Design a protein around this ligand. Structure first.
Ligand SMILES: [Mg+2]
Length: 278
């Protein structure tokens, strides 16, 4: 932690495919910035009617977060499982596994970094929520929270079971008393258990994928990391954003307001939020 937070924001925004987005990231109280993001409206080479947005919360360095931000989408869309809902979901799963294996082979990783990843792939008919770690995506529809991804915490029943089966333990709500997420990309020190596949390791790169039919009543999706969700609940943040959209249509601005509000509520983390309005 710094003595004084770096409150400078990086912002971006864009529009297309019947969406508008804004985003904001801030280093905040932490000594390093290790978050990254992806915002693609109109996926090229065939997926022009689709969009993808993601937030990556890095730890023990930026290297994994940064690489995901510019390569995960490629890994998802170009594998043989991706190339129907079934196939999209498998393609996403395959992309996560292949990037985790690929990154492992870089000279610096053979660097101890890891990253969460949360995203949405938006098609003309479906939203695919994607989660790996304790970042979170939430959908607001018809004036209510409609959907939330499930945070991957070591204390969760099935996460604890896998961890125990891999010879670890959950102590102080952390993997072997150190890692505060039970799923992530990178973190290779937690993926060296003999006799276990990639998805059976102390920390798993397997994402959970939730597909949701799109509705005319869809209002917005929020993607943010635990530095936001730590101080605001799903309903609390949705209602906040809703109240801000009442006075501003500048999504960068709205996102900056969210981030500053969470800082004032005491969040000492790096923070990244992406707001996608329909
Ligand atoms: Mg964080």
């Amino acid at each position: 932690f710094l003595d004084k937070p770096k409150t400078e924001k990086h912002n971006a925004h864009g529009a297309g495919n019947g969406l508008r987005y804004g985003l904001s990231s801030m280093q905040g109280w932490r000594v390093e910035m290790e978050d990254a993001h992806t915002a693609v409206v109109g996926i090229p080479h065939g997926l022009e009617d689709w969009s993808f947005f993601a937030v990556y919360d890095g730890h023990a360095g930026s290297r994994v977060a940064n690489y995901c931000s510019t390569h995960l989408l490629e890994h998802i869309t170009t594998n043989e499982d991706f190339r129907s809902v079934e196939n999209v979901k498998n393609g996403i799963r395959t992309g996560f596994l292949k990037i985790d294996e690929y990154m492992r082979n870089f000279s610096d990783l053979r660097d101890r970094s890891g990253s969460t990843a949360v995203g949405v792939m938006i098609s003309p008919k479906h939203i695919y929520f994607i989660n790996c770690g304790d970042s979170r995506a939430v959908l607001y529809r018809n004036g209510q929270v409609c959907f939330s991804t499930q945070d991957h915490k070591p204390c969760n029943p099935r996460e604890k079971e896998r961890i125990q089966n891999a010879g670890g333990s959950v102590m102080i709500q952390r993997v072997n008393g150190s890692l505060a997420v039970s799923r992530a990309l990178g973190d290779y020190d937690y993926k060296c258990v003999d006799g276990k596949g990639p998805t059976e390791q102390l920390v798993s790169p397997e994402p959970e994928v939730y597909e949701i039919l799109r509705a005319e009543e869809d209002e917005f999706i929020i993607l943010a990391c635990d530095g936001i969700w730590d101080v605001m609940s799903n309903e609390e943040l949705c209602e906040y954003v809703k109240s801000r959209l009442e006075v501003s249509d500048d999504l960068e601005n709205v996102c900056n307001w969210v981030v500053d509000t969470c800082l004032h509520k005491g969040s000492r983390d790096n923070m990244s939020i992406v707001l996608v309005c329909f």
